[PDB]
Design an enzyme around this catalytic site. Sequence first.
Site, PDB file in Angstrom:
ATOM      1  N   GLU A  26       0.792  -1.218   0.000  1.00  0.00           N
ATOM      2  CA  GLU A  26       0.000   0.000   0.000  1.00  0.00           C
ATOM      3  C   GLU A  26       0.830   1.277   0.000  1.00  0.00           C
ATOM      4  O   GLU A  26       0.366   2.297  -0.472  1.00  0.00           O
ATOM      5  CB  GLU A  26      -0.916   0.018   1.248  1.00  0.00           C
ATOM      6  CG  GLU A  26      -1.878  -1.156   1.292  1.00  0.00           C
ATOM      7  CD  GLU A  26      -3.017  -1.128   0.308  1.00  0.00           C
ATOM      8  OE1 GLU A  26      -3.771  -2.068   0.150  1.00  0.00           O
ATOM      9  OE2 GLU A  26      -3.156  -0.002  -0.328  1.00  0.00           O
ATOM     10  N   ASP A  45      -6.352   6.433  -4.893  1.00  0.00           N
ATOM     11  CA  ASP A  45      -5.851   5.096  -5.056  1.00  0.00           C
ATOM     12  C   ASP A  45      -5.916   4.666  -6.551  1.00  0.00           C
ATOM     13  O   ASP A  45      -6.373   5.397  -7.423  1.00  0.00           O
ATOM     14  CB  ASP A  45      -6.494   4.117  -4.076  1.00  0.00           C
ATOM     15  CG  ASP A  45      -7.908   3.640  -4.374  1.00  0.00           C
ATOM     16  OD1 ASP A  45      -8.575   2.969  -3.605  1.00  0.00           O
ATOM     17  OD2 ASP A  45      -8.354   3.951  -5.540  1.00  0.00           O
TER      18      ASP A  45
END
Length: 164
Positions: free
Chosen positions: A11, A20
């Site tokens: 991440e 994202d």
Amino acid sequence: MNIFEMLRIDEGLRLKIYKDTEGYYTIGIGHLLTKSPSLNAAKSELDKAIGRNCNGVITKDEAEKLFNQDVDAAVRGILRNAKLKPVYDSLDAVRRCALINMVFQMGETGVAGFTNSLRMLQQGRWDEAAVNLAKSRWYNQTPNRAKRVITTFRTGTWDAYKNL
């Protein structure tokens, strides 16, 4: 290697709101804020989540706190889930981390939809499951990460991340 290090690799860490890969507003270590287009909706969720006026930015500590919460919640979600629990219970410790990783990224519900792969993992058919998991939007959309997770399920070692 452990679940936290694993997910920190997949991440990354960002201290300012960001989008994202799906285009959603996120902060910290993959902490989804909202699926809404409004950056404003995002800033509000953020302040709500931190308990301060963040103005879109947070400290390392804050990101780590959110991370601890998300991991805990991912684990508890698996354990509460009728479909996920049995698979989890049937896995070794490394593979367990791989299921947590999927759940953190795609939510309980999404992973719970991998009916066929779950079944294979439960029966310990590694290679078969690796091949089935790859037939997903998940894999096609974020192939490097998906490959890492898949390899973890296939081999039961941290090889995929030992590089990284």
